Amino acid sequence: ELSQCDREPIHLLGGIQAYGVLLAFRGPDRRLEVVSANTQALLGRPPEALLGKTAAQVLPAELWAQWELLSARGALRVALPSGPYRALLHESDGLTVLELEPAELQPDMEETALELVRRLVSPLAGAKGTRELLQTAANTVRALTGFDRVMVYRFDADWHGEVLAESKREGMDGFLGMHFPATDIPVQARALYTRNPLRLIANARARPVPLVPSVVPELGRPLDLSGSALRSVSPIHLEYLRNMGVEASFSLSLLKDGALWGLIACHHLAPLHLSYERRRACEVLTQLLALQLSSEERAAEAAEDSHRAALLGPLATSLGAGGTLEEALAKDGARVLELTGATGAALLLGGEPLLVGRTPSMDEVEALAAWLAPQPFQTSFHTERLGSLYPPLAARADVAAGLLAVRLAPASSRLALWFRPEAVRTISWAGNPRKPAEPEPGHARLHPRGSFQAWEETVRETSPAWKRADLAAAEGFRSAL
Amino acid sequence: ELSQCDREPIHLLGGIQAYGVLLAFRGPDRRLEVVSANTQALLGRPPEALLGKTAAQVLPAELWAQWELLSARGALRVALPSGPYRALLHESDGLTVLELEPAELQPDMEETALELVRRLVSPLAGAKGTRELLQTAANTVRALTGFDRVMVYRFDADWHGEVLAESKREGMDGFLGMHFPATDIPVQARALYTRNPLRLIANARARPVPLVPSVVPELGRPLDLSGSALRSVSPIHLEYLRNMGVEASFSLSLLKDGALWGLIACHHLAPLHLSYERRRACEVLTQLLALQLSSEERAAEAAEDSHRAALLGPLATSLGAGGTLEEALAKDGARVLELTGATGAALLLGGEPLLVGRTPSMDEVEALAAWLAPQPFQTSFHTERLGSLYPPLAARADVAAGLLAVRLAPASSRLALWFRPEAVRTISWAGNPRKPAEPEPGHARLHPRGSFQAWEETVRETSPAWKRADLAAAEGFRSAL
């Protein structure tokens, strides 16, 4: 509920999960550093007893007998006298970092390593489109992970998220149509997700265990948790997870050629750990899905370019045919509208203008036609908040909140526009979850009923963004007369 | 040398490799089946001593202690009292198929699972075009297999193979550029490659271990080695490899969404097997590369559509400027030629039409223009064997072997063509690997020099086929005048 949710640096939380074991070496002599309370129990000796003396003394060298390989491998399992345990090597802030975690307890004779990828890519035979591809991907995640909830997010130009697809376990409610406010996610958190490939949160009941010593003189700031998969989350975001009530949660990032394309999240109401085998296999899936979505997106974009460019064909069908230009365009008015993407368009003959689809007020039409001239558009203007620039259309704003326009005739007063309303009626009513919860929430952090009000308020009185490729075909219409 | 190499059913070879061990069970009571002489040495008692008694009696049941899991897993490595062995479960000819194989002789604490996978997915950085994909994949497989050679094959409409890429170890001969006749690749063999993901041969000096009993009354024929990874190979292909002198070889199946795309293969002078760790990972690459190439092909096709649509621009450079149509098109005629793919094009004005690039002699150019009139083409003919269609122009096969034509005007004799000769100057002499074999070869059973002679025998007096996108653009030139 604090005003620092977007501003609190994730790197300064300090807290750690239940099963983490903080370790570190100092350069040549490899002297130890800050540790955690839970770290001592697995080794047995108390932390302050371990702290302050030499490395080899506190070091179970039978596990150090694998560091020569851990330097290159980075992580493989070792059978500690307690149980299976997965070694982890890291380096940060000029200091090396060691980590360990409870490995696969189940003996794992069958379903060995790398069987996951062959098990899951088999449905991925076609790879034809975008939506069904990721949908079936989430379906396969259901089979592999075997948890309750899976989720898919897509961003915006201003990175506002949107619910695209998911696949539910029976006995819950889908969240299709919901709009994710970009306000909740800090820019620092966005960068954190971009830099790292994966992240998981296993239990919402876990406590952000602090670290001692808290402060380190050589930075005047704690150690950044770059390579650690045990990093905690912002307390506001922790309260978010508590409110949404799912203890087990995964995050799978998609990165488009330097920029994080999207995020995939799995969930399970009960708390449950995950095998290293399953989590590590995801990174392979990340690359596959990223390349596939990149290829499919560029293919679809090219197809759209071709189709809307080939729409000059239907233009040429009407062009040359007998009758007035206006009636010929009106008979095929439908293809004219989505040609630019605007719901409607008018155009100045000197007399009355011809418009179809959405209908701006006639007198308002000539008023705006006159008002376009003082605006010095060399080629064209485009906007999403026309009411802000032009107050008098604030009344007729849910019919056009942002438009495109261009000179019909550069010489004479003949002009043309391309109006589009505010984006509310486009998406279905699914932008709400319905069924209000009985307990009264503060709801400033809860997307159902409570949140998404900031999202809708921000997008309120705004039309969808424009596309340069649409303006590309504008010169084609320019040569009509 | 036999004429049945194309027609020989590979399912009827019967034989098996040296180190394989034939095993099978009959349904409920799991009674035994055909066996081999080499197999008995693994168990100890002679093969005829095996015959006639119960399943468990011939069965080392301590290995069967894992069969209940084998029903699902299909395979694990089991330590026979002699040495380690990998179990294989399969079913064929309405009959169970069981197989063992010499396991990894390497103690292989290293060479763990998916570490090779992470080794090989790292080079998948760019993944932008088409060539570099398989090129880098082959470069990875070079160090992966650690053997002499890797190879790339691509088929045609009638499935003829052509060398796309390769990477050599120093001290051998490159094999770029040759066209392989699809005749030596039987249709049944092609189907076998389609159905299975893997196939390999570790030694050509191995022997075709016989199978007893050779025939069975229920089939009057041996058992099919479909699912077996140890199936023998026909002596003709063995002779081919012997002429090559390469005893060790691997193979890849490449499938385009229901149809086999191409082939990837490995080679090595010394006879040597492959680790069972490596071979399982090979199957994973197949589906991933298949879907990736499907997506890349769709993207490339869309890009090509946009490009041929974008050719309206360079075309529009000629249009609009003053001057005759003929000279304006002739000045930029260079870019016009590759628009359709033909080396030249003209267009009948009633007078002399102008053509560039390669040139058919002008008088018989009018003669062929006239000859097109009796043929009642609605809009166009498209051909690759004009010599068969029109005998006299077969003389200038090197000037025209297959062309595309189109009517400038339906009523009047104004037509346009796109002539393209036989693909001989287009492809270099890389169809011959030179260095003639000092021992006199039959060269009908040898790829070097002797082969690809049949391919050029077939493809003589024949241009490459046309593609549909340019045929769509035929209406583009149609509306010029």
Could you tell me which residues are beta bridge partners of residue A212? Answer: A35
State residue B472 phi and psi, 5-degree precision.
-65, -40
On chain B, the residues whose CB falls within 8 A of the CB of A305 are 306
CB-based contacts of A1: which residues, under 8 Å, 6+ apart? A236, A239, A442, A444, A445
| Domain segments of chain A as ranges | 106-301, 312-422+461-478
For the domain covering A312-422+461-478, report its CATH number.
Answer: 3.30.450.270
Residue A477, SS3 per DSSP: helix
Q: Are the C-beta atoms of residues B353 and B362 closer than 8 Å to each other?
A: no
On chain B, the residues whose CB falls within 8 A of the CB of A140 are none
Closest-CA distance, B291 to chain A, in angstroms, reads: 6
* Alpha carbons B4 and B234: distance in angstroms, whole number: 11
Residue A18: DSSP 8-state: T
Closest-CA distance, A110 to chain B, in angstroms, reads: 7
On chain A, the residues whose CB falls within 8 A of the CB of B114 are 113-114, 280-281
On chain B, the residues whose CB falls within 8 A of the CB of A118 are 283-284, 287
The verdict on a CB contact (< 8 Å) between B112 and A299 is no
The verdict on a CB contact (< 8 Å) between B280 and A114 is yes
On chain B, the residues whose CB falls within 8 A of the CB of A117 are 117, 284
Classify each residue of A155-164 as buried b or exposed e, where b means 16 or more C-beta atoms within 10 Å of its C-beta. Answer: beeeebbbbb
Would you identify the CATH topology of the domain A106-301?
Answer: Beta-Lactamase (3.30.450)
CB-based contacts of B102: which residues, under 8 Å, 6+ apart? B19, B83, B84, B85, B273
CA-nearest residue to B73 within chain A is A110
The verdict on a CB contact (< 8 Å) between A122 and B296 is no
* Alpha carbons B101 and B42: distance in angstroms, whole number: 11
On chain B, the residues whose CB falls within 8 A of the CB of A288 are 288
Q: Are the C-beta atoms of residues A189 and A234 closer than 8 Å to each other?
A: yes
State the amino acid at position B230 in one-letter form.
L
Query: Chain B residues within 8 A (CB-CB) of chain A?
Result: 69, 72-73, 76, 112-115, 117-118, 121, 124, 127, 257, 280-281, 283-284, 287-288, 290-292, 294-296, 298-299, 302-303, 305-306, 309, 479
Q: State the DSSP H helix or E strand holding residue B152, giving kind and residue range, or none if neither.
A: strand B149-154
Closest-CA distance, B386 to chain A, in angstroms, reads: 33
Q: Are the C-beta atoms of residues A326 and A354 closer than 8 Å to each other?
A: yes
Of the candidates B76, B280, B309, the beta carbon closest to that of A309 is on B309
Residues in chain A: 481
On chain A, the residues whose CB falls within 8 A of the CB of B127 are 291
For the domain covering B10-299, report its CATH number.
Answer: 3.30.450.40
Kindly write down the DSSP assignment for every residue of A163-195, as one continuous string: EEEEEPPSSS---TT-EE-TTSS-HHHHHHHHH
Express the helix, strand and coil content of chain A in percent, nearest 5 each.
35, 15, 50
On chain A, the residues whose CB falls within 8 A of the CB of B479 are 316
The verdict on a CB contact (< 8 Å) between B291 and A114 is no
Residue B320: DSSP 8-state: T
What angle (nearest 5°) sits at the alpha carbon of residue A393, between those of residues A390 and A395?
140
On chain A, the residues whose CB falls within 8 A of the CB of B76 are 109-110
Tokens of A481: 């007369």
Residues in chain B: 481
Of the candidates A127, A291, A306, the beta carbon closest to that of B305 is on A306
| Exposed/middle/buried for residue A137 (C-beta within 10 Å: 0-12, 13-18, 19+) | buried
The verdict on a CB contact (< 8 Å) between A110 and B73 is yes
Same topology for domains A106-301 and A312-422+461-478, yes or no? yes
Q: Which of B276, B291, B475 to mutate to probe the A interface, most A CBs <10 Å?
A: B291
What is the CATH architecture assignment of B320-422+460-478? 2-Layer Sandwich (3.30)
* Alpha carbons A247 and B240: distance in angstroms, whole number: 62
CB-based contacts of A103: which residues, under 8 Å, 6+ apart? A77, A83, A84, A85, A86, A275, A276
The verdict on a CB contact (< 8 Å) between A110 and B69 is yes
- With left for phi above 0 and alpha for psi between -120 and 50, is residue A7 left, alpha or beta? alpha
The verdict on a CB contact (< 8 Å) between B294 and A110 is no
* Alpha carbons B462 and B471: distance in angstroms, whole number: 20
